[PDB]
Design a protein around this ligand. Structure first.
Ligand SMILES: [Zn+2]
Ligand SMILES: [Zn+2]
Ligand SMILES: [Zn+2]
Length: 178
């Protein structure tokens, strides 16, 4: 197994996947690494199993259909995995914890949002459809772009949104387009 966390790339108290060489801090994995379970398989491995059990699940889909899906266990898992792919990027630090807004010439957003809040909402089964999870994720970056206006810091929202959107298209097998 790897000797660093797959998510944050640091050493520490690591839990090792039984079916692949990845390792994780307890609260870096999503969901948080399960108490018992020998063997244990990470979220990467659980997603790959879904695909292997239903190869047709990789055929192209329309985003509008994916958003309307109810949050049954496979969709729950796919959203957890997508959230974890965003935490995998180091620039997620800027969007992890609760923001505050005091900048001359700007007003904070009406509905603040952040990654740890989405993480808690998934854990608590607060989303009934994929659409709820995706709307809160996109709101994080939209809030950032609107608040930072012409400051070059706006670019961090574009960058992490691009990670989100590429992983969304991959995980949910969105039909490729020009
Ligand atoms: Zn970690
Ligand atoms: Zn694994
Ligand atoms: Zn099938």
């Amino acid at each position: 197994n790897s000797n660093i966390c797959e998510v944050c790339n640091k050493w520490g108290r690591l839990f090792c996947c039984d079916t692949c060489p990845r390792s994780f801090h307890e609260h870096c994995h999503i969901p948080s690494v399960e108490a018992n379970k020998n063997p244990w398989s990470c979220i990467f491995c659980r997603i790959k199993t879904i695909q292997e059990r239903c190869p047709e699940s990789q055929s192209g889909h329309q985003e509008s259909e994916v958003l309307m899906r109810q949050m049954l266990p496979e969709e729950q898992l796919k959203c957890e995995f997508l959230l974890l792919k965003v935490y995998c990027d180091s620039k997620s630090c800027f969007f992890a914890s609760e923001p505050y807004y005091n900048r001359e010439g700007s007003q904070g957003p009406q509905k603040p949002m952040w990654l740890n809040k989405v993480k808690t909402s998934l854990n608590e089964q607060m989303y009934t459809r994929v659409e709820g999870f995706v709307q809160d994720m996109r709101l994080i970056f939209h809030n950032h772009k609107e608040f930072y206006r012409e400051d070059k810091f706006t670019r961090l929202g574009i960058q992490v949104q691009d990670i989100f959107e590429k992983n969304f298209r991959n995980i949910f097998a969105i039909q490729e387009t020009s």
